[PDB]
RNA sequence: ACUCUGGUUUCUCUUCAGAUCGCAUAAAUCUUUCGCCUUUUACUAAAGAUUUCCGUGGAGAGGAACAACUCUGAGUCUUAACCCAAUUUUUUGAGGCCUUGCUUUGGCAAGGCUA
């Protein structure tokens, strides 16, 4: 009666206000109804599904964007008919979803690196840097290279649109370079050649 | 070194209370200062789309500027915490300064708009019917008949009323030279154009 | 004038008639002359022309209405009163009326009350609704619900309506609304098997200084203490009413024997020298109590001798070793230690046990998981009473009637109560709206938090 | 205060006075002067202006009066006879005219405060019109006369000219609004005070002549006051006053005897305190201590004027000789406000104003406690005596002799006599007084009437306040936490109680709505609702005005509707009303209570309406004074009038409902004439019940309105701007961007400031004052009030119009966007099909 | 026009500080949020709580200088030429008699008579 279905509702804060799910009354009620229906058919003793750890996204007249997070990729699909004037292929991380039957493009998946994977990579870099008191420079740089390509070859198309990840990669790279520099000499160099 | 202002209407939305409200609202007056966001850094800044925030129900005529949100803070934004209500208005001080001291202190200078007496306009007001019964005693006169209407100190004294604090008071307590900011009233005003 | 000629009686649907909501107009937000539609179940403004109820009547073709104040039925499109014996059930649900004959025999009858929806229920066993996890309030109210004398005092609105109230007082909202909730709980002709105390919750929130809010759960013992004190204070009138219903039912008397202890580093000879001073000698303080606070022994810190952690077990008389002349309990304040002895002097007709399950350690708040083994049918407290007060108190046997049980971590606290239905040996566990028949043996296996006992 | 209590029992020594005027004209400062007169321990600070009535923290911080503050003091007159003054300090801001209206109801006379430097401002004219229409005595108090001396520096002749011009303009306004000849205001008649509340100056001609008499002696101050104004020159040779100037440079008696001494007093202090001030004070009989001559110029002026002018007696003379006592003014008060009128038995009993009799107290204001939990009703005791601990019957606003359901029995708690910051706790209050009543909060919303619980059944209620302005600004409110909705609803009902003009309603979409008069009004409402009362965080939507719907052409199709049983058919058409007819209906020029003959004569004479059509009028508007007309145009030869009249009430009610809630939006229907052409009525009375006719009447009203070319009407504000000569261009520039056109830009006589009058849409007026003050460096100040409804440009029903999400629409697209977004906010369908 | 009232300035000291101590405005420390981050010492900038410092007011106390000069307040704030009375007292026509009631008598009460 007090319209509190919007309080605990989770949506993707990674996207702008007009890009994430719009929390109307009808569609929030529909999403909570869907989650309740799915949770009903699962016995509590056998397993459970938590609303807080779940995300429910709708697409209606009042929601032009469909949101989901699959395998570390945060994707937002936007049909060409909704809010989409025309297609731009200049952006690298936008997938041109194409209707197979009509051989025509109908939607665009806007890819983005999930924040959980961001935090995982940042924690991996922190773990590498912490275990570097006795570690040689070659081993530190090898661990950096391994983690960095494991991240990049996975999110090859999704990093570019993810501006928060670009700033994180540079920060972590500079952090490990500073680690090597301070391993060399205590005082920081004014300029240190990249060679 | 002084300020030509006669009232504090010049500092509308540009005073201490207005700047306190700005800082507490994480908002920047165009000529005012800028501060880091208050303790409510992420209180409701990233509120998502809602049926109450629905832009489809909002009629746009003129954008709600920061000045609107500071002049009427409890109306034009949500969560107005640590917000000070600025002074609404003071009646326009209409003091007319005199350039030539030779002119009389009480004088109808051209700046004042003329008053239409409009005696020819139909207007009837009660009259004593020329009753000769009432005659003033020979020893009664208007008050202060001997004293003149104005002296050479009248215009200067009147001008001292509409003066900044050090010069509008005839006596005070001495202050150390450190405590006197001679330019504090310069940056408190709006920065000149160009 | 054309009563008994209304053709809209069949239009009334008793399923949606829920009077648990606040009596305010759906548009004008006015409590005055609130009219409840009997077709849609909503509240409206009034009977007159250009009123919200009148407009609603000619809009949705809802021709039957009920006056929530005067208990009268009206057909606003025609504006004539409806008087019939068929609709008398609705008025009873809205404003239950309990006579002395019904009140006296309310504890000696056993029949499944019939609800409109088709689900059977019982009066006094009705489970309350949860609003943002307020299970502590529901448990406390159900514990007070099972108390016969307080219920009978609150089942009659005239028992406290004609008392004097201070002009600025708001504590009386906790009395009349509590009586309304008691009447609703014991309603034998309720339309549903559950009662939702929205107005009662608003009264609790308003009377408190924003304490025990509906949104966030609170301590059961603290809420019960505040509720009992407010009921005693509100019913005290514009004076010091020493003997109220709450005082006569729950309040007892105990004697406190306090002996201050010197600093531990003080030598024995100097300790004996200070023993001559009255500061470190016994001091008698006789203070009445609203409830008895029983402190559990510290939970086991290791496993047993068989490498298997064991749930602590304590007899009821072991935690009842307090409140007697033999046991001396040390009170370690932040400054000095005291040896405060307790001596029972006046057993109340109904005794309330408040086990201190939650204590705050040096860093956080922990819950004691100790399980108390207590017989629920025969406990004698004559031994704990003094020889001077055992003669006047010829009755000491107590029977458990309610047991509030807290389960889970303090943050994710869950409150359940095992009530005893008077007139039958059955015990009912009340978890939120769910009523479950629980065998008498299973109650003692739960973490008892608040208990109420009857002398009989 | 025992003498104060004993003065209450004498209705002849009681004055119920309302202080009214434009914003910042010295009303509050005047009440502060009166309190300083009566309370020796309460003294204004040297620099900070004491604001004794401004008890609200919002009033103190904003520096603007917001709510009325009652003050009950014992003020002696010129002859030393003490009276009992009930003084209402009404706010001067145009957005808070509701408090002024509430004060005027429980008052018998009006003291109008006008700034001397300023002319007759917008709120001055509005309150003059309101007080005249409320049938109250009008007295002018031209305040801030020090401005003409220390600020404008005008010669005394020009100061007299400015004061005379102000008096002439006020007299012209009163003559235009009223008809009574004896309403002429002039200081000779004693209706006008000249005062300076900053420097504690207050005098009439009588009081200043009394000063002469006390100083010189052997002078009839009453007869001397009749010469101290107008073109009555004084001849020193003959010691007599002549209408002809004896000399070329002879001054008026007012100038020579009043304005010259005032100028000399205010000029020997501001400029010559150091030398020749003690000589002047000795010449005036004023003695000041050594430590009092060391004060600054402004406190010195205040002290010197307090010594020279003493107590405030000219104001008391004005309010005693011209403002009638409760006993004298009871009869017009009952004739105007009471529903039953003076003809009823109680109406006759009210005119006696007997302290012992039928208790009938009318309350128009409600003041909240410190915690905000409890409200105290405030109003006038018009008959009988109320007592503490006494049960009362508290009639509502919908209470009538038939229903008797809006009333409720309550026990009166403690009673108080309210004087701003402190209240005198009393045990009883006789008739003709103002009393604070507790224990009566719950049944009272807006105005109310309090009577004895038993023994009085003839007792009707008093007519509710007819506010001078309509609350058109609407804002939606929602809590930040949806779980705290009950707290917000309690706060909404509290602010509804505490604001006479506030209107809190819930739309069909569950959106809570607050109706206000302006930006400052709703800002204060929201500040109260957040800080006090609800004590919770609340979200505010962007302000949006409320629209009205009309028709610009007659319907091209004879719309028809049928009852569900299909036994009744109504044919109706809708056409626009004649110009000025809706305004006349709203202004209560013509009433539904008029007999058909006079109504037909008025419509035929002043509107050229045919006698057959003029006498067939059935109902007016959504309400009794609504701006819509229902005309029964059915030919008697075709439909039986007696058969048709059997369902007249039901079709009238359906018409009122349909005009209340329009087809296009849930908005009022304005300026539409409805003609009943064909009305087939069933004969059996079971099939022609209200529940069948009323929905059918509403549907046929909707169909007739929709077929006729519909338009949206928006509220337009009237704006008065005080700006200098160089700031007029900036005002023009600001008004251009907001669809505002200027109707008048005239210089203020006696001041270098100009006055620009313009009409601005109320939806483009948001932030208009802020923009005007920012663009003019604060030199242009404006007040906006609702004036009239105007048709929104464009076609509301044009489905080809495309509305952009966050872009202002052009002029042709305004109506369509307004209707669509209003429907979206209300929660209705996307668009209205003409079929429905 | 009467009599008593009895300072101002300055240097110290001791305490109390609401109040814009201050119509001016510093620094340090601690605890939270950040910003830089690689460790001290510096910091970034907001909030909260402290301390110090540059100053300030009132009162109290003790010296010095002009100690001799007067204030203010109180006290009753104290005087004659020529001119005057229909609303309260030195110019004011206000007198007497009788009746009857009544008081223990004296007297009182009312009315009448005038000139």
Residue numbers in the entry:
A (entry chain A): 1120 to 1314
B (entry chain A): 245 to 438
C (entry chain U): 100 to 555
D (entry chain C): 116 to 951
Task: Reproduce, without paraphrasing, sentences from the article in which this PDB structure was first reported.
Here cryo-electron microscopy analyses of human CE pre-B complex and B-like complexes reveal extensive structural similarities with their CI counterparts. The results indicate that the CE and CI spliceosome assembly pathways converge already at the pre-B stage. Add-back experiments using purified CE pre-B complexes, coupled with cryo-electron microscopy, elucidate the order of the extensive remodelling events that accompany the formation of B complexes and B-like complexes. The molecular triggers and roles of B-specific proteins in these rearrangements are also identified.
We affinity-purified CE B-like complexes (generated ) and subsequently determined their cryo-EM structure. We subsequently determined the structure of the B-like protomers at 3.1 Å resolution in their tri-snRNP core. Nucleotides downstream of U+2 base pair with nucleotides at/or near the U6 ACAGA box, forming a U6/5′ss helix, similar to the situation in CI B complexes. Notably, a second copy of the 5′ss oligo (denoted oligo 2) also binds, which extends the U6/5′ss helix through additional non-canonical base pairs and base-stacking interactions. This structure therefore mimics the extended U6/5′ss found in CI B complexes. The zinc finger (ZnF) regions of the B-specific proteins FBP21 and SNU23 bind side by side to the backbone of 5′ss oligo 1 and 5′ss oligo 2, respectively, stabilizing their base-pairing interactions with the U6 snRNA in the B-like complex, analogous to their spatial organization and function in the human CI B complex. For example, in the B-like complex, PRP8 adopts a half-closed conformation and the BRR2 helicase domain is translocated to PRP8En. Moreover, essentially all of the remodelling events that have been described for the U4/U6 proteins during the formation of the CI B complex also occur in the B-like complex. These include, among others, the repositioning of the PRP6 HAT domain (PRP6HAT) and PRP31, and the disruption of U4/U6 stem III and the U4 snRNA quasi-pseudoknot. Taken together, our data reveal that the tri-snRNP has nearly the same structure in human B-like and B complexes.
